[PDB]
Amino acid sequence: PCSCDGDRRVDCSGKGLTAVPEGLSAFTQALDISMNNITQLPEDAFKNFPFLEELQLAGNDLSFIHPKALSGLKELKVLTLQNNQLKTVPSEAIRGLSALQSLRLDANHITSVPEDSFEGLVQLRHLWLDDNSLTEVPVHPLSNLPTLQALTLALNKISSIPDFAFTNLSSLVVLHLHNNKIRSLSQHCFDGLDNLETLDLNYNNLGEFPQAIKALPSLKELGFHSNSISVIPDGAFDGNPLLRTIHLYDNPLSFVGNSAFHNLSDLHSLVIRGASMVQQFPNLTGTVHLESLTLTGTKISSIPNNLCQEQKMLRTLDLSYNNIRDLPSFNGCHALEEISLQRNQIYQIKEGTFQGLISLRILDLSRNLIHEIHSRAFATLGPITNLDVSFNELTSFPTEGLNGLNQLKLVGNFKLKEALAAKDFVNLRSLSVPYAYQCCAFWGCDSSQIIIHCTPSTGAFKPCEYLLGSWMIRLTVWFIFLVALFFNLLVILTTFASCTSLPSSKLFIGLISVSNLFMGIYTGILTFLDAVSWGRFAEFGIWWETGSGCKVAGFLAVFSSESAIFLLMLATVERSLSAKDNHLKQFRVAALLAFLGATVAGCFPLFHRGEYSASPLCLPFPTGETPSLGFTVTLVLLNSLAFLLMAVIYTKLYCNLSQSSMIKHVAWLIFTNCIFFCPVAFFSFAPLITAISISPEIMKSVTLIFFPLPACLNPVLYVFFNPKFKEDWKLLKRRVTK
Amino acid sequence: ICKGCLSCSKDNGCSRCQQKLFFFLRREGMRQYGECLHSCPSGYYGHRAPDMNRCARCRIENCDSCFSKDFCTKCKVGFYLHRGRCFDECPDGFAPLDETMEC
Amino acid sequence: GSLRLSCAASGYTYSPYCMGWFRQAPGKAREGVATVDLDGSTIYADSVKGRFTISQDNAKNTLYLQMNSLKPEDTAMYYCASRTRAGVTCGLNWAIFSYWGQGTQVTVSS
């Protein structure tokens, strides 16, 4: 079944025969028996092909090679035995192969390597021995053959490298030793490797820095990442000045010598992370071909003023997670395309810091203490796409030089109350601003080939043009405010001014009138604010919510509502007491206590942070999750509570059953107030539950409709459905006529 | 189809190459699928890891089989081989011979 | 029971260096049951002491191995291996020995 290519090359992989194929041409020069099921090669198995030149025995469960089996293969050059079950390197089986160039013995379960092994292999060039179970480096077999050029010993159980282990491999070029359990390296373990150009020590147990690598003058690639090493001392690479790449990541490092990375002329990258005991910039004299630089998580507070003028080919510069507070002048470097200064202590950006960086594309200044940026800091800076100054304390932001900026991030700068004109950022695609009102003028109706995405959204609780919204909601709010104000004033004047004796019920009615008047004053505040800023509210919300006016409006609203509810409960208690059968002074004291409680409830959100500024309505019931959950849940809890106690009380006298009249007035008051409180509580609770989805515009409209409505309604009922008021009005008219 | 792979899916072919085997990713037009082979193919060198053994491009130029990502074993016909380096002109101090195609 | 396993030198004497006896299970690796080095030094494996003994002699260059305490699991393909190139140290693996015999197969009885 062997597939013959006809070019003196034979393929026999995978057809499952357990012996050497027979009947093959005598002139063949390549033969493949991989994937087969050959376990042992009998004596003189390959004597039929004296012209063989490449042989592959991989995948076979082969675990024995006769000493004379591979004899007579003088012209063989490549021999692979990978994946097999050879328990030891075959010493007295490859002895006669005097013209072999490459030998694979990797992925076998090799435990021991006979000392006499590898004798006579005067033409070997590459050796594979990785993924084996060798406990120590075989010194004699390696010393046997001096012509080796590549060697790998990875994925093994070697723990220490003895002195002069590789003394005689003068021609070695590549040495792999990664994925091992090496933790101790002798001072002379790497002697004689004059031509070595690649050393791999990754994934080991090294804790102290290897002193041996000082004897590798031709080193070009060195890797020791994912080790235990912590200290890299000065003179680490002094003996190997041809280094190009060094891999040292995934290593817990504390201190790196100041002269560790000097005189490496062709080193092109440098990444150091976690070296927490470093406090000064490395001596980089002699290192001029650096393309990248990454010093992260250290205590460096300065950057050399000659870094830009030395590294001509610098392309990336990462200096985050340090204590850098003063920046040098970057004008020297032209190829620099990314700069990261994230999470540092920089407090100022001057116009000279970024002058002349003609190729800078990405700039990061997130999470620093910058409070002043020069107006022309980015003026002559070249074509930049990404800018990031998030989580600083910025008061103003420059405009010139940022027209071709695709991305901008300004979040976290709560003092940045200005507005960014969309004329400057004609090509911006993604924006982040501290306040949602700043992105209103930017995206317009989008949030004409704009596709501009702004991080803080304006979901009708941060209005762009009109605060109240549709015309009908503006008219009804205006009407509510007018009627509430006028009728509350009229009720107060009739009840209090024209009187000589104040019964408890009448005084309570007057107090509810006062609270409703305060609610109406809040509604008038809202109406005038909307009217003044009509179609331009995006220029007002930042000043409104983060100002004293919103605090005033929120306090007025909360105080009026709480006072009305508490006075409604006190009236329900007095009605019960009057129906039971002086205490008028006691009830006056109780009314003062209720007023004080309403005042303290209103004042409470002032010291707490993040409630009165949630919405331009200055209410503690905004859209979405309430930032101060506790305050809102308490307020609604104790409101529904007092509602249920007065409901229970009036149920009690209903069961129990002039003075008999006017009780229905208080009943209607409790009816209207409770049925108007339910929607506000329901739509404050709704955003907490993810099951119910409510459009924010409808929520805001209904809140604006029903929050102040009881203030509009109560004096209407007192003024039209109570003969008590008609008598008071007659008395007032009689007093006026006098 | 699937040969020597822990997981056999139609879309990705063999996946999660097992034990001593080397996972190789190959493409036919847009679609692609993987195989489990020991000998990494030409223009490809095998890297061994405890997780999974991978196969990667010989980033060395003008090479047909490479020992590692820096070292090359067989140089393309028409160019010279020396110290794992493939070039066209034999460096000074060495006497090249054309039959073996190496310095 | 007990049985005599004798392996002799076909040509030039094989006693000048280490000679041993190996056993191979059907289809897997040859494993070494015993070995003897010049000067009479002998090494046995884990399941060999007390039930297998080996001795050379250079009088007529021949190895011999008394086997006893017969167990069912200890039935395999037995070979005698030799090495006369000197050097190195004696061992228990197959790779070291330069010469191999055709071996004898014995089945456990009682």
JSON list of N, CA and C in Angstrom, two decimals, chain A residues 35 83 131, chain B residues 2-9 12-25 34-39 47-55:
[
{"chain": "A", "resi": 35, "resn": "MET", "atom": "N", "xyz": [3.44, 6.67, 11.85]},
{"chain": "A", "resi": 35, "resn": "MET", "atom": "CA", "xyz": [2.03, 6.34, 12.15]},
{"chain": "A", "resi": 35, "resn": "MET", "atom": "C", "xyz": [1.80, 4.83, 12.17]},
{"chain": "A", "resi": 83, "resn": "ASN", "atom": "N", "xyz": [8.08, 10.74, 19.52]},
{"chain": "A", "resi": 83, "resn": "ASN", "atom": "CA", "xyz": [6.77, 10.11, 19.92]},
{"chain": "A", "resi": 83, "resn": "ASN", "atom": "C", "xyz": [6.75, 8.55, 20.36]},
{"chain": "A", "resi": 131, "resn": "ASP", "atom": "N", "xyz": [10.73, 17.20, 26.09]},
{"chain": "A", "resi": 131, "resn": "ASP", "atom": "CA", "xyz": [9.54, 16.41, 26.50]},
{"chain": "A", "resi": 131, "resn": "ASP", "atom": "C", "xyz": [10.00, 14.99, 26.87]},
{"chain": "B", "resi": 2, "resn": "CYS", "atom": "N", "xyz": [-11.31, 12.93, 11.46]},
{"chain": "B", "resi": 2, "resn": "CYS", "atom": "CA", "xyz": [-10.67, 13.18, 12.75]},
{"chain": "B", "resi": 2, "resn": "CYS", "atom": "C", "xyz": [-9.75, 12.02, 13.09]},
{"chain": "B", "resi": 3, "resn": "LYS", "atom": "N", "xyz": [-8.49, 12.34, 13.40]},
{"chain": "B", "resi": 3, "resn": "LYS", "atom": "CA", "xyz": [-7.47, 11.34, 13.66]},
{"chain": "B", "resi": 3, "resn": "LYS", "atom": "C", "xyz": [-6.62, 11.82, 14.83]},
{"chain": "B", "resi": 4, "resn": "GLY", "atom": "N", "xyz": [-6.72, 11.12, 15.96]},
{"chain": "B", "resi": 4, "resn": "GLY", "atom": "CA", "xyz": [-5.91, 11.44, 17.12]},
{"chain": "B", "resi": 4, "resn": "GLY", "atom": "C", "xyz": [-6.18, 12.80, 17.74]},
{"chain": "B", "resi": 5, "resn": "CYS", "atom": "N", "xyz": [-7.45, 13.13, 17.94]},
{"chain": "B", "resi": 5, "resn": "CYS", "atom": "CA", "xyz": [-7.84, 14.36, 18.62]},
{"chain": "B", "resi": 5, "resn": "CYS", "atom": "C", "xyz": [-8.86, 14.04, 19.69]},
{"chain": "B", "resi": 6, "resn": "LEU", "atom": "N", "xyz": [-8.76, 14.74, 20.83]},
{"chain": "B", "resi": 6, "resn": "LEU", "atom": "CA", "xyz": [-9.69, 14.52, 21.93]},
{"chain": "B", "resi": 6, "resn": "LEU", "atom": "C", "xyz": [-11.11, 14.89, 21.53]},
{"chain": "B", "resi": 7, "resn": "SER", "atom": "N", "xyz": [-11.28, 16.01, 20.84]},
{"chain": "B", "resi": 7, "resn": "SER", "atom": "CA", "xyz": [-12.59, 16.47, 20.39]},
{"chain": "B", "resi": 7, "resn": "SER", "atom": "C", "xyz": [-12.61, 16.52, 18.87]},
{"chain": "B", "resi": 8, "resn": "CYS", "atom": "N", "xyz": [-13.68, 16.01, 18.28]},
{"chain": "B", "resi": 8, "resn": "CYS", "atom": "CA", "xyz": [-13.84, 15.93, 16.83]},
{"chain": "B", "resi": 8, "resn": "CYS", "atom": "C", "xyz": [-15.10, 16.69, 16.44]},
{"chain": "B", "resi": 9, "resn": "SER", "atom": "N", "xyz": [-14.92, 17.91, 15.94]},
{"chain": "B", "resi": 9, "resn": "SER", "atom": "CA", "xyz": [-16.01, 18.73, 15.45]},
{"chain": "B", "resi": 9, "resn": "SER", "atom": "C", "xyz": [-15.86, 18.97, 13.96]},
{"chain": "B", "resi": 12, "resn": "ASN", "atom": "N", "xyz": [-14.32, 22.82, 13.16]},
{"chain": "B", "resi": 12, "resn": "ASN", "atom": "CA", "xyz": [-12.92, 23.03, 13.50]},
{"chain": "B", "resi": 12, "resn": "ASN", "atom": "C", "xyz": [-12.07, 21.78, 13.33]},
{"chain": "B", "resi": 13, "resn": "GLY", "atom": "N", "xyz": [-12.61, 20.73, 12.72]},
{"chain": "B", "resi": 13, "resn": "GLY", "atom": "CA", "xyz": [-11.84, 19.51, 12.54]},
{"chain": "B", "resi": 13, "resn": "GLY", "atom": "C", "xyz": [-11.42, 18.93, 13.88]},
{"chain": "B", "resi": 14, "resn": "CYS", "atom": "N", "xyz": [-10.18, 18.46, 13.95]},
{"chain": "B", "resi": 14, "resn": "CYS", "atom": "CA", "xyz": [-9.63, 18.00, 15.22]},
{"chain": "B", "resi": 14, "resn": "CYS", "atom": "C", "xyz": [-9.34, 19.19, 16.12]},
{"chain": "B", "resi": 15, "resn": "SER", "atom": "N", "xyz": [-9.66, 19.04, 17.40]},
{"chain": "B", "resi": 15, "resn": "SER", "atom": "CA", "xyz": [-9.41, 20.07, 18.39]},
{"chain": "B", "resi": 15, "resn": "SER", "atom": "C", "xyz": [-8.95, 19.41, 19.68]},
{"chain": "B", "resi": 16, "resn": "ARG", "atom": "N", "xyz": [-8.22, 20.18, 20.49]},
{"chain": "B", "resi": 16, "resn": "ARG", "atom": "CA", "xyz": [-7.63, 19.69, 21.73]},
{"chain": "B", "resi": 16, "resn": "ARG", "atom": "C", "xyz": [-6.72, 18.49, 21.45]},
{"chain": "B", "resi": 17, "resn": "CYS", "atom": "N", "xyz": [-5.65, 18.76, 20.71]},
{"chain": "B", "resi": 17, "resn": "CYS", "atom": "CA", "xyz": [-4.67, 17.72, 20.38]},
{"chain": "B", "resi": 17, "resn": "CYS", "atom": "C", "xyz": [-4.13, 17.09, 21.65]},
{"chain": "B", "resi": 18, "resn": "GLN", "atom": "N", "xyz": [-4.07, 15.76, 21.66]},
{"chain": "B", "resi": 18, "resn": "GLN", "atom": "CA", "xyz": [-3.81, 15.01, 22.88]},
{"chain": "B", "resi": 18, "resn": "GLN", "atom": "C", "xyz": [-2.34, 14.63, 22.99]},
{"chain": "B", "resi": 19, "resn": "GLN", "atom": "N", "xyz": [-1.91, 14.50, 24.25]},
{"chain": "B", "resi": 19, "resn": "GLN", "atom": "CA", "xyz": [-0.55, 14.02, 24.57]},
{"chain": "B", "resi": 19, "resn": "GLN", "atom": "C", "xyz": [0.63, 14.51, 23.73]},
{"chain": "B", "resi": 20, "resn": "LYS", "atom": "N", "xyz": [1.42, 13.65, 23.03]},
{"chain": "B", "resi": 20, "resn": "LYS", "atom": "CA", "xyz": [2.68, 14.02, 22.32]},
{"chain": "B", "resi": 20, "resn": "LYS", "atom": "C", "xyz": [2.39, 14.70, 20.98]},
{"chain": "B", "resi": 21, "resn": "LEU", "atom": "N", "xyz": [1.18, 14.55, 20.44]},
{"chain": "B", "resi": 21, "resn": "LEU", "atom": "CA", "xyz": [0.79, 15.19, 19.20]},
{"chain": "B", "resi": 21, "resn": "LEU", "atom": "C", "xyz": [0.89, 16.70, 19.01]},
{"chain": "B", "resi": 22, "resn": "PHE", "atom": "N", "xyz": [1.02, 17.17, 17.75]},
{"chain": "B", "resi": 22, "resn": "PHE", "atom": "CA", "xyz": [1.15, 18.63, 17.46]},
{"chain": "B", "resi": 22, "resn": "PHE", "atom": "C", "xyz": [-0.06, 19.13, 16.69]},
{"chain": "B", "resi": 23, "resn": "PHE", "atom": "N", "xyz": [-0.76, 20.11, 17.23]},
{"chain": "B", "resi": 23, "resn": "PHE", "atom": "CA", "xyz": [-1.95, 20.71, 16.66]},
{"chain": "B", "resi": 23, "resn": "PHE", "atom": "C", "xyz": [-1.57, 21.67, 15.53]},
{"chain": "B", "resi": 24, "resn": "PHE", "atom": "N", "xyz": [-2.14, 21.45, 14.35]},
{"chain": "B", "resi": 24, "resn": "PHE", "atom": "CA", "xyz": [-1.85, 22.26, 13.18]},
{"chain": "B", "resi": 24, "resn": "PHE", "atom": "C", "xyz": [-3.15, 22.79, 12.59]},
{"chain": "B", "resi": 25, "resn": "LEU", "atom": "N", "xyz": [-3.17, 24.09, 12.31]},
{"chain": "B", "resi": 25, "resn": "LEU", "atom": "CA", "xyz": [-4.35, 24.77, 11.78]},
{"chain": "B", "resi": 25, "resn": "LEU", "atom": "C", "xyz": [-4.18, 25.00, 10.29]},
{"chain": "B", "resi": 34, "resn": "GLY", "atom": "N", "xyz": [-8.30, 21.90, 11.83]},
{"chain": "B", "resi": 34, "resn": "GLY", "atom": "CA", "xyz": [-7.04, 21.45, 12.38]},
{"chain": "B", "resi": 34, "resn": "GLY", "atom": "C", "xyz": [-6.82, 19.95, 12.35]},
{"chain": "B", "resi": 35, "resn": "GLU", "atom": "N", "xyz": [-5.55, 19.57, 12.36]},
{"chain": "B", "resi": 35, "resn": "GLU", "atom": "CA", "xyz": [-5.12, 18.18, 12.36]},
{"chain": "B", "resi": 35, "resn": "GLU", "atom": "C", "xyz": [-4.11, 17.96, 13.48]},
{"chain": "B", "resi": 36, "resn": "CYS", "atom": "N", "xyz": [-3.89, 16.70, 13.81]},
{"chain": "B", "resi": 36, "resn": "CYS", "atom": "CA", "xyz": [-2.94, 16.30, 14.85]},
{"chain": "B", "resi": 36, "resn": "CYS", "atom": "C", "xyz": [-1.84, 15.48, 14.19]},
{"chain": "B", "resi": 37, "resn": "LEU", "atom": "N", "xyz": [-0.68, 16.11, 13.99]},
{"chain": "B", "resi": 37, "resn": "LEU", "atom": "CA", "xyz": [0.47, 15.49, 13.36]},
{"chain": "B", "resi": 37, "resn": "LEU", "atom": "C", "xyz": [1.69, 15.63, 14.25]},
{"chain": "B", "resi": 38, "resn": "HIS", "atom": "N", "xyz": [2.62, 14.67, 14.15]},
{"chain": "B", "resi": 38, "resn": "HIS", "atom": "CA", "xyz": [3.89, 14.80, 14.86]},
{"chain": "B", "resi": 38, "resn": "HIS", "atom": "C", "xyz": [4.86, 15.68, 14.09]},
{"chain": "B", "resi": 39, "resn": "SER", "atom": "N", "xyz": [5.22, 15.27, 12.88]},
{"chain": "B", "resi": 39, "resn": "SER", "atom": "CA", "xyz": [6.16, 16.03, 12.07]},
{"chain": "B", "resi": 39, "resn": "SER", "atom": "C", "xyz": [5.47, 17.30, 11.57]},
{"chain": "B", "resi": 47, "resn": "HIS", "atom": "N", "xyz": [6.33, 23.64, 18.30]},
{"chain": "B", "resi": 47, "resn": "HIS", "atom": "CA", "xyz": [6.66, 24.10, 19.65]},
{"chain": "B", "resi": 47, "resn": "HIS", "atom": "C", "xyz": [5.91, 23.23, 20.65]},
{"chain": "B", "resi": 48, "resn": "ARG", "atom": "N", "xyz": [6.62, 22.76, 21.67]},
{"chain": "B", "resi": 48, "resn": "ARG", "atom": "CA", "xyz": [6.06, 21.85, 22.66]},
{"chain": "B", "resi": 48, "resn": "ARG", "atom": "C", "xyz": [5.76, 22.60, 23.95]},
{"chain": "B", "resi": 49, "resn": "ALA", "atom": "N", "xyz": [4.55, 22.41, 24.46]},
{"chain": "B", "resi": 49, "resn": "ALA", "atom": "CA", "xyz": [4.08, 23.04, 25.69]},
{"chain": "B", "resi": 49, "resn": "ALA", "atom": "C", "xyz": [3.29, 22.02, 26.48]},
{"chain": "B", "resi": 50, "resn": "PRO", "atom": "N", "xyz": [3.20, 22.18, 27.81]},
{"chain": "B", "resi": 50, "resn": "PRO", "atom": "CA", "xyz": [2.44, 21.21, 28.61]},
{"chain": "B", "resi": 50, "resn": "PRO", "atom": "C", "xyz": [0.97, 21.25, 28.23]},
{"chain": "B", "resi": 51, "resn": "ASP", "atom": "N", "xyz": [0.47, 22.44, 27.88]},
{"chain": "B", "resi": 51, "resn": "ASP", "atom": "CA", "xyz": [-0.95, 22.59, 27.47]},
{"chain": "B", "resi": 51, "resn": "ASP", "atom": "C", "xyz": [-1.16, 21.85, 26.16]},
{"chain": "B", "resi": 52, "resn": "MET", "atom": "N", "xyz": [-0.73, 22.42, 25.04]},
{"chain": "B", "resi": 52, "resn": "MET", "atom": "CA", "xyz": [-0.88, 21.85, 23.72]},
{"chain": "B", "resi": 52, "resn": "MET", "atom": "C", "xyz": [0.30, 22.20, 22.84]},
{"chain": "B", "resi": 53, "resn": "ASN", "atom": "N", "xyz": [0.75, 21.24, 22.03]},
{"chain": "B", "resi": 53, "resn": "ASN", "atom": "CA", "xyz": [1.90, 21.42, 21.17]},
{"chain": "B", "resi": 53, "resn": "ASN", "atom": "C", "xyz": [1.41, 22.05, 19.87]},
{"chain": "B", "resi": 54, "resn": "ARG", "atom": "N", "xyz": [1.99, 23.20, 19.52]},
{"chain": "B", "resi": 54, "resn": "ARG", "atom": "CA", "xyz": [1.55, 23.99, 18.39]},
{"chain": "B", "resi": 54, "resn": "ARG", "atom": "C", "xyz": [2.52, 23.88, 17.22]},
{"chain": "B", "resi": 55, "resn": "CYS", "atom": "N", "xyz": [2.07, 24.36, 16.07]},
{"chain": "B", "resi": 55, "resn": "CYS", "atom": "CA", "xyz": [2.89, 24.44, 14.87]},
{"chain": "B", "resi": 55, "resn": "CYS", "atom": "C", "xyz": [2.81, 25.87, 14.34]}
]
